[PDB]
């Protein structure tokens, strides 16, 4: 129900090994040389 010891910095940075985020799909647009998400519309002269 409550922690018996504190958590060391070593054990805290290992648990956070997998707490990260990945970049999006983000391909280049053919109409404008740009970047857009895959399968979404372009936010710059919206084409698809």
């Amino acid at each position: 129900a409550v922690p018996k010891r504190r958590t060391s910095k070593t054990r805290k940075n290992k648990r956070r090994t997998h707490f990260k985020i990945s970049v999006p799909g983000m391909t280049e647009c053919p109409n404008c040389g740009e970047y857009k998400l895959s399968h979404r519309v372009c936010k710059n002269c919206g084409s698809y």
Binding site: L37, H39, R40, V41, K43, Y48
Partner: protein, 120 residues
């Protein structure tokens, strides 16, 4: 069938509003869960219009809402008149379809996934 986070009484009323908004505006931005669900509701209504008779105009009124459309130069129209008159003549040779979903990014205040629904 999705449930969309509502209760079956609120989920029914929310699609009768979504469907009558496609009939009027022809194009709306929703979320992508309400778009996948409401395409089935508006396409089952297009076939009632292009079917034509009186008993199918009686079954379209169980779903559409009582809204008036202001045409050009004050010639008002009911959302059930616009569906059996005008949306039922351009879709008279298409066999399924009638509608188009287009994805957009996540919106800002929650990352819900924006989408546009058209009529094709």
């Amino acid at each position: 069938y999705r449930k969309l986070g509502r209760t079956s009484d609120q989920r029914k009323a929310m699609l009768r509003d979504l469907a009558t908004s496609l009939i009027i505006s022809e194009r709306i931005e929703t979320t992508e869960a309400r778009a996948k669900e409401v395409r089935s509701v508006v396409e089952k209504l297009i076939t009632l219009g292009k079917k034509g008779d009186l008993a199918s105009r009686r079954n379209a009124a169980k779903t559409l809402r009582n809204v008036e459309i202001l045409n050009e130069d004050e010639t008002t129209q009911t959302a059930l008149q616009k569906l059996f008159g005008e949306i039922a003549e351009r879709y008279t040779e298409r066999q399924g379809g009638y509608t188009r979903i287009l994805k957009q990014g996540p919106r800002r205040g929650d990352g819900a996934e924006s989408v546009i629904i058209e009529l094709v």
